[PDB]
């Protein structure tokens, strides 16, 4: 179930994005509703450090690929 | 007095913007000097979290409405 | 002939926006109610000046301009717009939509004189969509 | 006539990407191998769908679009593009490059029919550059020190790996590797390189010299 | 027309170099096997990039350059080199041997177009001798 | 007619070299100032004899000879040198450049008589480059870390100093300074630079950003 | 003919910047004094290299580039710039302003030869504005 | 006196070279005998670490400037 | 036996070279194989100080006499 | 006609070199004595083979070659060398100086036949200088 996917405390972001995109594209949603759902799940899941990282984006991110690129650039190396 | 308006530690940003725009438009300034003053007061007042949020704007904000929209988008939900 | 909206209805709508907010379905219903007859740019501009605060009013001016620009792009994409005419001399400029054209600036009577009913309904629909955008954005 | 790539080769390449990663030189060599003949947008799209995960695939779609847009800007900047023609009726739109044009959406046969060989090679080079970008993005040289117990060949391997797999220009890797050999590589080897009667102007020469005169221990 | 070497053979050769080392007679036999057809500078360069580590690859680049320079000295010492021509306009520069000449940098197709078979076999023999030197040097 | 340089200016320059050193930018600016008009070999030789100590003077004589030899190789590689002439009888020998030719040894007047303006400017540029070499030689960036208690502007000053006063090419200093800001500069500032919503592509921009958003303490 | 600035004046200005700081009105007056005659890019570059520390010098290089870019935008917006000419062959590129053009890199004499007086005064005003920005930014 | 100059245990090499070249050039030697004397004094003075550093020079150093450059390159940083 | 000759810990280098050249020239090797053997025995015998001294030779030594001269020049006086 | 040096004198000189060393003034005087008449390459080579040990003999071969090369450079720098002739057909190659030329290898009689007196004295002076160098180098 896509709506139950959370980014674990120790999980990296690319694994979380892979799992989420997999569960959203392999589901019962229409094809035209996958990108907005993936974006809004990146924003509300993806534990509050990345949540604030996406929130304070000086540019407007309108695509899952752009969000992934931005987060991978500005992520907290740890 | 517009030049004495600060955003309180607990005040939201829309209330501060309302108060500031009210005091600036209901003052003795010429009509052509209100927008630059409102912008430069958004930048120097509006306690340092929002100050840094406006400073690190990848786009150039040249209107009080655009600044308000940007800050409302990327504000720290709390 | 131009007739202004009642300040009593405008005061009631302003208090509705003040207590219920911008996004409540009752507020949108009230706005649709006061958006029933096609309004002149003067009417909608003063209405939004009164019911909205300063910052929402700035946002609404921006959104209204953007929506009117989309309308004018569709109008130059189709010469059969109810605001347009058949010849090129009736093409509608944004100065005529925003009430900035000649013979209209600050004068609602002249505004009502030169404007088309299609112009009025397009302006009204644009203002309603802009209000919806700003309401979704403010909260 | 369109012929698909072997699913056996694609499965082997997918397992290579799965074990070695996206950035290994063997993986890039394998991709160059399967990128030998000019592929149709359908082929490259399905290939990246199979070998890449979901998030790298999104990144790759983005990068491929950007590179194709740069190509189309260069094409409108020069009417002699091998994808273009002489008249204005042969100008190539991004719908024709991404396979979105009329008569191409979902049909590889029609795709192969209408596409030009210059179009195919441009699409292929764009996809290769996009793959390189995403591989460099999906996965620090100035923090590398030679450990007290580490040998010198291991330190050199680690340093050259981290310097060549980084964001430096190609013309800045050798001087950086040399100056990192000189300042890292704990003070015994530092003094060994400092007191070199000859001038060492290449990482290979420095490695050879140090391996010759190193303190056997 | 340029055809790349199989990544399966290259992977097997890389694992051979990884387990047996650089100097084992089986490894040299395998290299001689994959060095059978005359390779373009692109092929040999990528092959050594994949099978050799970073430091042996640097050493091999050095040794390959030195051996190619000896070849070019012998070529300017004899105008009948299978890489050279009869006139002075076919003299082969090191930019053409290392693949750095015009129309060759990064493009294997153009490389295969402009290169001579004598050029290819000379490059190949030079690369083999350089590999032997580096293997004798590494261990 | 030959006019000597003022001993007052030479004394001031000598004291500048004595207090600031050979490599300070103020010293190089002063040398460029006193290197404005084309000097005769006698002038530059006596100038370096006075301002430099014995060992730096020996080093400078060596470097000046090497640079003049490179100049003479370029001159025999091009008969259109402003020091050369069109015929072979105007070819310039190193005895004429170093002031050792006939009619010049020890006599500045005869020197100024026979020398060409192109000869003078070539000698002057050679001497300036030799001075730069010796200054870089007479007195490690990859070992610089920001201390736990050190401020960021001090760390940036130290790092930029050590990177610009090193053996790197001029086109490799900015990327190295950036990548050293990112990997050194203890993990608080590392994370501050990492989470930059904008892309910082210049050391000045990175310094400005960090100074804006730094943790006041 | 190029004449360098006195190292005595430069030393005094450097000590002024060292004791009074970058933002004092006396320091800005001294900079305006040493910014009186139109300087070549070499002069201003070496001056800022000597009087400013490493980090302020980086900031100043950035700011100078930005201001010169604004100048070049205004120049392409008006073909009557005192740095420009009437034909298109006199258009001034940033390589010519920053001293990076052909015949100018590292040579102040050639610089003074090819540069225009309008070019010099524009470079000088740009450098002064950049110094003001960096001084306001540093403290 | 030039023949009494030794490099002190704590003295740097450039100071020793300066002192030695000063005392040799400001002495009663002919001009054609200063360079060989300076070289042979670099080799026999200049305490045994630098003595061995000059001795094991793969190249032949035939000038005081070249010796100074070599020693400054390969000296023991301390 | 030439292949059993080592330079003793206290032995000088000229004595070791004399002994080695004697044993190599007074042996059963062909005349054309004595110089390479003498060189390679200088390199592998001749205890590791001289081994490293010969290894770090900026020039290529291709004759026993040249190796002997180089080592005698740069040897550690003791 | 070639006459060999007395083995008695050679034995006495060898014992002198054995007891006094290579650098004693008495040893150099004795060498000058046995270096009085111009010797053929065979004579000097065998003399140094007998009086010098193996390692000094290698050093002496090196030094003799270097000095002979300097002599041949001076000879190609002056066509009036007592070893040279006027035409180009008498130019003296190092094979003729070291005794390696045709008709000379191993045969002292043929050597004495083809060699010039200037050749002999040049070879002798070269050998003496080489002996001096090696003696100064050995101890």
Q: What is the DSSP string of B4-53?
A: G----SS--HHHHHHHHHHHHHTSSS-GGGHHHHHHHHHHHSSTHHHHHH
Q: Give CA separation, D192 vs C33, D189, G80, I47, in Å.
A: 88, 5, 63, 20
Q: Hey, what are G73's tokens?
A: 């935008």
A 10 A CB-CB count for F89 gives 6
Stretch (H or E) spanning C49: helix C41-51
CA distance H7 to H13: 7
Any chains having at least 3 CB pairs less than 8 A from chain I are: D, H, J
List chains adjacent to chain E, taking adjacency as at least 3 C-beta pairs closer than 8 Å: D
Task: State whether F137 and H64 contact (CB < 8 Å).
Answer: no
Q: What is the resolution of this structure in A?
A: 7.8
Provide the sign of the torsion angle of the four alpha carbons G89, G95, G99, G105, taken in this order: negative
Tell me which residue of E114, F201, B21, D207 sits closest to C55, measured CA to CA. Answer: B21
Q: Is any Cβ of chain H less than 8 angstroms from the Cβ of I59?
A: yes
For residue D172, the 8-state DSSP code is G
Burial profile D41-63: b = 16 or more Cβ within 10 angstroms, e = fewer: bbbbbbbbeebbbbbbbbbbbbb
- Asked whether the beta carbons of G17 and G57 are under 8 A apart, the reply is no
Q: Do F205 and G62 touch (CB under 8 A)?
A: yes
Q: What six digits make up the tokens of G99?
A: 């001293």
Q: Which of H52, H55, H59 sits opposite I58 (nearest CB)?
A: H59
For residues F92 and F119, the answer to whether their CB atoms sit within 8 Å is yes
Taking 3-state DSSP, the helix, strand and coil percentages for chain E, each rounded to the nearest 5, stand at: 70, 0, 30
∠ CA E109-E111-E115, nearest 5°, is 130
CA angle J127, J128, J133 (to 5 degrees): 95
HEC string for F35-64: CCCCCCHHHHHHHHHHHCCHHHHHHHHHHH
* Assigned token pair, A20: 């989420």
Q: Both tokens of residue D127?
A: 């996809």
H72 touches chain D (CB under 8 A): no
* Pair of tokens at residue F10: 């030479």
Q: Which is it for the CA torsion I12, I15, I21, I23, positive or negative?
A: negative
Chain I: closest CA distance from residue J1 (Å): 31
Handedness of CA E68, E69, E72, E74 (dihedral sign): negative
Query: For residue D107, what is the DSSP state?
Result: -
| Cα atoms in the Cβ-side hemisphere of radius 13 Å centred on H5 | 22
Tokens of F164: 């610009």
Please give, rounded to a whole number of angstroms, the shortest distance from the CA of C110 to a CA of chain B: 25
Task: Spell out which residues of chain B touch residue F194, defining contact as CB-CB under 8 Å.
Answer: none
Q: Taking the C-alpha atoms of F179, F180, F185 and F190 in order, what is their torsion angle to the nearest 10 degrees? A: 10
**Window 10-29 of G, Cβ < 8 Å to F:** 10-11, 14
| Rounded Cα gap, residues E58 and D207, in angstroms | 9
Q: What secondary structure does DSSP assign to I2-34, as a single string?
A: GGG----SS--HHHHHHHHHHHHHTSSS-GGGH
Q: State the CB neighbour count (10 A cutoff) for residue F160.
A: 24
Domains observed in chain A: 2-74 (1.10.1200.30)
H-helix or E-strand containing B59? none
Are A and D touching by the rule of 3+ CB pairs within 8 Å? Answer: yes
Q: Does A72 touch chain F (CB under 8 A)?
A: no
Residue D197 contacts residue H57 (beta carbons within 8 Å): yes
CB D52 within 8 A of CB D35: no
Reading the block at residue J34, the tokens are: 């046995």
E25-to-E28, E125, E127, E134, G21 alpha-carbon distances in Å: 5, 18, 17, 15, 72
Task: Give the integer Cα–Cα distance in Å for A49 and A56.
Answer: 11
Tokens of J64: 């003799």
Do D and F touch (≥3 CB pairs < 8 Å)?
Answer: yes
Q: How far from the centroid of its chain's Cα atoms is residue D206's Cα?
A: 28
Distance of alpha carbon F179 from alpha carbon F16, whole angstroms:
35
Interface test with D, best of H13, H74, H77, H78 (most D CBs within 10 A): H74
Does residue A74 belong to the interface with chain F, where contact is any CB pair within 8 Å? yes
Q: How distant, in Å, are the alpha carbons of I42, J56, J57, J100 from that of J52?
A: 20, 6, 6, 22
3-state DSSP call for residue A61? coil
- CA distances in angstroms from F36 to B10, F39, G49, G50, listed in the order given: 65, 8, 19, 18
Residue of H nearest to F135 (CA): H69
Burial F40-49 (b: 16+ CB within 10 A, else e): bbbbbbbbbe
Query: For chain D, how big is the Rg over CA atoms in Å?
Result: 23
CB within 8 Å of D209: residues ≥ 6 apart: D193, D196, D198, D200, I56
Rounded to whole angstroms, how far apart are CA atoms D17 and D52? 8
Contact J46, J9 (CB under 8 A): no
Is H73's CB within 8 Å of D191's CB?
no
Instruction: Give the chain F residue nearest G42 (alpha carbons).
Output: F29
Contacts of residue A68, Cβ cutoff 8 Å, sequence gap at least 6 = A13, A14, A17, D55, D58, D59
Q: Which chains touch F (3 or more CB pairs under 8 A)?
A: A, B, D, G, H
Cα separations in angstroms, B40 against B62, B69, C54, E65, J24: 10, 16, 17, 63, 96
Q: Does any CB of chain F come closer than 8 Å to the CB of residue B56?
A: yes
The torsion defined by the Cα of I1, I2, I3 and I4, in degrees rounded to 10, comes to 60
One DSSP character per residue, D14-74 reads: HHHHHHH-SS-HHHHHHHHHHTSSPPPHHHHHHHHHHHS-HHHHHHHHHHHHHHHHHHHHH
Q: Give the whole-angstrom CA distance, residue E27 versus residue J8.
A: 63
**C-alpha torsion D70→D71→D75→D76, nearest 10:** -20
For chain A, give the number of residues: 78
Handedness of CA B27, B28, B31, B32 (dihedral sign): negative
Separation of alpha carbons C47 and G100, rounded Å? 59
Contact yes or no for J47/J123 (Cβ under 8 A): no
Report how far residue A21's alpha carbon sits from residue D58's, in angstroms, rounded to the nearest whole number.
10
> CA–CA distance from H49 to each of D193, E82, I77, J87 (Å)?
17, 55, 12, 57
What is d(CA H63, CA B66) in angstroms, rounded to the nearest whole number? 72
Q: Coil, strand, or helix at residue J56?
A: helix
Shortest CA gap D172–chain F (Å): 6
Tell me C35's DSSP state: T
Which among H14, A14, F90 has a CA at the least distance from the CA of D137? A14
Give partners of A (≥3 CB pairs < 8 A). Answer: B, D, F
User: Which 8-state DSSP code applies to residue F180?
Assistant: H
Q: Is the dihedral of CA D21, D26, D30, D31 positive or negative?
A: positive
Give the integer Cα–Cα distance in Å for G59 and G65: 10
Nearest CB among I56, I76, I77 relative to H58 is that of I56
Asked if H53's CB is within 8 angstroms of D197's CB, the reply is no
How far is it, in rounded angstroms, from Cα D64 to Cα D70? 10
Return the closest-CA partner of residue I5 out of I38, I32, I29: I38
Is any Cβ of chain F less than 8 angstroms from the Cβ of H72?
A: yes
Q: Which two tokens stand for residue J24?
A: 């004693």
- DSSP states along G33-78: HHTSSPPPHHHHHHHHHHHS-HHHHHHHHHHHHHHHHHHHHHHHT-
Neighbouring residues of D25: CB distance < 8 A, sequence distance ≥ 6: E46, E49, E50
Per the CB < 8 A criterion, the answer to whether F153 and D159 are in contact is no
Q: Which of G14, G53, G59 sits opposite F208 (nearest CB)?
A: G59
Q: Which residues of B touch C138 (CB under 8 A)?
A: 14, 72
Q: After which residues is chain D broken (C to N over 2.5 A)?
A: 139
**What six digits make up the tokens of A32?**
């035209």
- The minimum CA-CA distance between F148 and chain B, rounded to whole Å, is 25
Counted residue by residue, chain G has a size of: 139
Cβ contact, residue pair F157, G55, below 8 Å = yes
Backbone phi, psi, residue E14, to 5°? -65, -40
Distance CA D144, CA D158 (A): 8
D-chain CB neighbours of E130 within 8 Å are none
| Interface residue A42 vs chain D (CB under 8 A) | no
Give CA–CA dist I21/F64, Å, rounded.
47
Mention every residue, 6+ apart, whose C-beta is less than 8 A from residue F25: G46, G49, G50
What one-character-per-residue DSSP string does H7-76 give?
--SS--HHHHHHHHHHHHHTSSS-GGGHHHHHHHHHHHSSTHHHHHHHHT-SSPP-SHHHHHHHHHHH--
Instruction: From residue A32, give the alpha-carbon distance in Å to each of A29, A36, D19.
Output: 8, 8, 34
HSE toward the beta carbon, residue F123, CA cutoff 13 A: 27
Q: Do I65 and J58 touch (CB under 8 A)?
A: yes
Residue A6: phi and psi, rounded to 5, are: -120, 150
What single-letter DSSP state applies at residue B62?
-
Beta carbons of F96 and F119 less than 8 angstroms apart: yes
CA-nearest of E67, E85, E80 to E122 is E67
Determine the residue of chain E that is closest to D203 in CA distance.
E58
Say how far apart CA F166 and CA E39 lie, in whole Å. 41
Q: Nearest-CA neighbor of D57 among C45, A45, I24, A22?
A: A22
Separation in Å, CA of A78 to nearest CA in chain F: 9
Task: Indicate yes or no: CB of A59 within 8 angstroms of CB of F191.
Answer: no
Beta carbons within 8 Å of F46's beta carbon, 6+ residues apart: none
Q: Do the beta carbons of residue D122 and residue D82 sit within 8 Å?
A: yes
Number of H helices, E strands in chain I: 4, 0
Which chains have at least 3 CB atom pairs separated by less than 8 Å from chain D? A, E, F, H, I
What does DSSP assign to residue J90? Answer: G
Is the Cβ pair D209, I56 closer than 8 Å?
A: yes
For chain H, list the contacting chains (3+ Cβ pairs, <8 Å).
D, F, I
d(CA D62, CA A70): 12
Q: What is the maximum alpha-carbon separation in chain E?
A: 49
Using DSSP's 3-state secondary structure scheme, residue D134 falls into helix
As a whole number of angstroms, the distance between CA I27 and CA I25 comes to 6
Q: Does J32 touch chain I (CB under 8 A)?
A: no
Distance from the D195 Cα atom to the nearest Cα atom in chain H, whole angstroms: 4
Instruction: Write the secondary structure of E52-99 as one string of H (helix), E (strand) and C (coil).
Output: CCHHHHHHHHHHHHHHHHHHHHHHHCCCCCCCCCCCHHHCCCHHHHCC
Q: Do chains I and A touch (3 or more CB pairs under 8 A)?
A: no
Total number of residues shown for chain E: 139
Cα–Cα nearest to G42, from G82, G85, G2: G2
Distance from C-alpha of E41 to C-alpha of E2, rounded to nearest angstrom: 12
For residues E119 and G126, what is the distance between their CA atoms, to the nearest angstrom? 56
Best CA proximity match to D49, nearest among F88, F198, A47, A21 = A21
Residues D156, E54 contacting (CB under 8 angstroms): yes
Between CA B24 and CA I37 the distance in angstroms is: 98
Pairwise CA distance, residues I18 & A30, whole Å: 93
**Of J31, J9, J53, nearest in space to J125 by CA:** J31
- Asked if the C-beta of C61 comes within 8 angstroms of chain B's C-beta atoms, the answer is yes
Query: Six-digit token pair at F157?
Result: 């000053």
Chains H and F share 3 or more Cβ pairs within 8 Å: yes
Q: How far apart are CA G27 and CA E93, in angstroms?
A: 60
DSSP H helical ranges for chain A: 13-25, 34-44, 48-55, 64-74
CA–CA distance, E117 with D94 (Å, rounded to integer): 41
F213: buried, middle or exposed (CB in 10 Å: 19+, 13-18, 0-12)? middle
B73 contacts in chain A (CB < 8 Å): 55, 60
């Amino acid at each position: 179930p896509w709506a139950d996917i959370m980014q674990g405390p120790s999980e990296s972001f690319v694994d979380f994005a892979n799992r989420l995109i997999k569960a959203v594209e392999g589901s019962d949603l229409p094809p035209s509703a996958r990108a907005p759902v993936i974006i809004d799940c990146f924003r509300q899941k993806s534990q509050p450090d990345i949540q604030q990282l996406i929130r304070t984006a000086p540019s407007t991110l309108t695509t899952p690929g752009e969000i992934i690129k931005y987060v991978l650039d500005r992520q907290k190396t740890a």
